[PDB]
UniProtKB/Swiss-Prot annotation, chain A:
Core subunit of respiratory chain NADH dehydrogenase (Complex I) which is composed of 45 different subunits. Component of the iron-sulfur (IP) fragment of the enzyme. Interacts with NDUFAF3. Interacts with NDUFAF7. Interacts with CERS2. It is found in: Mitochondrion inner membrane. The gene is NDUFS2. The chain holds residues 196 to 249 of 463 of the full protein. This is NADH dehydrogenase [ubiquinone] iron-sulfur protein 2, mitochondrial. Core subunit of the mitochondrial membrane respiratory chain NADH dehydrogenase (Complex I) which catalyzes electron transfer from NADH through the respiratory chain, using ubiquinone as an electron acceptor. Essential for the catalytic activity and assembly of complex I. Redox-sensitive, critical component of the oxygen-sensing pathway in the pulmonary vasculature which plays a key role in acute pulmonary oxygen-sensing and hypoxic pulmonary vasoconstriction. Plays an important role in carotid body sensing of hypoxia. The lineage of its organism: Eukaryota, Metazoa, Chordata, Craniata, Vertebrata. Belongs to the complex I 49 kDa subunit family. It comes from the Eukaryota.
From Swiss-Prot, chain B:
It is found in: Mitochondrion inner membrane; Nucleus. Accessory subunit of the mitochondrial membrane respiratory chain NADH dehydrogenase (Complex I), that is believed not to be involved in catalysis. Complex I functions in the transfer of electrons from NADH to the respiratory chain. The immediate electron acceptor for the enzyme is believed to be ubiquinone. Involved in the interferon/all-trans-retinoic acid (IFN/RA) induced cell death. This apoptotic activity is inhibited by interaction with viral IRF1. Prevents the transactivation of STAT3 target genes. Complex I is composed of 45 different subunits. Interacts with CARD15, but not with CARD4. Interacts with STAT3, but not with STAT1, STAT2 and STAT5A. Interacts with OLFM4. It comes from the Eukaryota. The chain crosses the membrane at residues 27-46. This is NADH dehydrogenase [ubiquinone] 1 alpha subcomplex subunit 13. The chain holds residues 32 to 74 of 144 of the full protein. It comes from Bos taurus (Bovine). Belongs to the complex I NDUFA13 subunit family.
Amino acid sequence: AMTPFFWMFEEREKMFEFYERVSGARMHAAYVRPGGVHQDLPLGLMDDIYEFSK
Amino acid sequence: XXXXXXXXXXXXXXXXXXXXXXXXXXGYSMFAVGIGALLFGYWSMMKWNRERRRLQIEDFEARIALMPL
């Protein structure tokens, strides 16, 4: 099947915009740490999560 | 003043909603159009073959008419 791969990877590439705005690299992040969470969510992201989920 | 990330939900995006529903086709109604197209198909086709018979006999008549050939 060719279509369901490319149908979701458009949406999946939008998902790494959340990762880039919350941490340095695209995929792997040193974000979850023994001290909880390394860095707080920026002001732009919290409005984007609701916009994505809709 | 402290400024942090604010919470917003508004519509909650609707948690698990069905989008798949029956459209256009019902069941019995599709067979009325399906087999209905077949019955219309044969009746239209066979009338042309009867019109072909008008040409057919007339074509073979040319051979009988031509004896100097």
